[PDB]
C-alpha cells in the first residue's frame, strides 16, 4: 500500500458522511489498492550439509547398481560427434532408447553426439548430481568419470 | 407454422409497453389492429409496427394467410438502460434510467 501509485489523501471526512471511514485508495481494502502479504523477491537457496550431498551422490549411484542399471564404458568407439554415431554405439551396448540414460563423460565429442536424443541427459563428471541420476532409469560413465566420482565421495 | 417480429432497443419503458401488449395477446390480427388504433398510449404506436411487421412476415415468408392470423405469443423484454443525470437540490446528482424494451410478437394460424 506504500509502493502503489496513489495519493495519501483521505478520500472523504472521517465522520458525518454516511459512508465507511477510509484513508487513501491504496489501502488493500480497495480495488486497485495494495496487496497485503504478497510475494517479494526471495532467496530459496540454503547450504545443505556437504556430507549430506556427498552421501546422497554416493547413495544414488549405489541405487542404480543395486538394480543392475549402471554401466561403465572404457571408451565410445566410433563416436566422433555425430548423433547416428552415438546411436550405433548405443545399439552394441543395449541402450536402445526405451530407457532414460544419464551419459556421464568428459569427452566433449560424445556428449555432443547424444545431447539431442530425447532419452539422454548428458553430463560432465564434475556435474554428477542426484536429481539427474534419479531422473533417469540407468547410468553410463567413462571409466575416466568413474574415477572422478570415486574422488568426490572419498 | 409461426411468424415473429422483434423491435429491439425501442426507447420506452418496458413496464409501460407491457400494458399495451396485454390488450392484444391471443387476439386475432383484426381485433389487435382495432384495439391498438384507439388505445390512448404511446406504446401502441410501437406495438402496431411490430404487429404489422410480423404479419407481413407471415404472409410473405411463411405461407400463412392474413385472414387466419392471431397473436399466439407476445412479450416485452427489457434492454440496456440509458443512464442520465438529473440535478437535485443541495448539489446532488440523481441518475435517471431511460429504460429500453425489446418487443416481440408471434403470430399463428387459427384454423377454423
Amino acid at each position: 500500500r506504500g509502493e502503489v501509485a496513489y495519493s495519501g489523501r483521505k478520500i472523504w471526512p472521517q465522520k458525518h458522511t454516511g459512508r465507511a471511514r477510509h484513508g487513501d485508495i491504496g489501502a488493500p481494502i480497495f480495488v486497485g489498492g495494495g496487496v497485503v502479504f504478497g510475494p517479494k523477491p526471495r532467496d530459496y537457496s540454503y547450504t545443505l550439509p556437504k556430507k549430506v550431498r556427498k552421501k546422497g551422490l554416493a547413495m544414488a549411484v549405489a541405487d542404480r547398481a543395486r538394480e543392475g542399471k549402471l554401466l561403465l564404458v572404457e571408451a565410445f568407439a566410433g563416436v566422433n560427434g555425430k548423433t547416428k554415431e552415438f546411436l550405433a554405439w548405443a545399439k552394441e551396448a543395449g541402450l536402445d532408447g526405451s530407457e532414460s540414460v544419464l551419459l556421464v563423460t568428459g569427452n566433449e565429442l560424445v556428449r555432443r553426439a547424444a545431447r539431442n536424443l530425447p532419452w539422454v541427459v548428458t553430463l560432465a563428471p564434475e556435474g554428477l548430481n542426484v536429481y539427474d541420476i534419479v531422473r533417469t532409469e540407468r547410468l553410463v560413465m567413462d571409466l575416466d568419470a568413474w574415477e572422478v566420482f570415486q574422488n568426490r565421495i572419498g | 407454422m409461426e411468424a415473429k417480429a422483434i423491435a429491439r432497443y425501442v426507447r420506452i419503458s418496458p413496464r409501460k409497453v407491457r400494458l399495451v401488449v396485454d390488450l392484444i395477446r391471443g387476439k386475432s390480427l383484426e381485433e389487435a389492429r382495432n384495439i391498438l388504433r384507439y388505445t390512448n398510449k404511446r406504446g401502441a404506436y410501437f406495438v402496431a409496427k411490430v404487429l404489422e411487421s410480423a404479419a407481413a412476415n407471415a404472409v410473405n415468408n411463411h405461407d400463412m394467410l392474413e385472414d387466419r392470423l392471431y397473436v399466439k405469443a407476445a412479450y416485452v423484454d427489457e434492454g440496456p438502460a440509458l443512464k442520465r443525470v438529473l440535478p437535485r437540490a443541495r448539489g446532488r446528482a440523481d441518475i435517471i434510467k431511460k429504460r429500453t424494451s425489446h418487443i416481440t410478437v408471434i403470430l399463428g394460424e387459427k384454423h377454423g
Partner: peptide
C-alpha cells in the same frame, strides 16, 4: 459525489 451535504444538527439532549 465529492460534495457531502452536512448533517442536520441533533436535537439537544442535555
Amino acid at each position: 459525489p465529492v460534495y457531502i451535504p452536512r448533517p442536520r444538527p441533533p436535537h439537544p439532549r442535555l
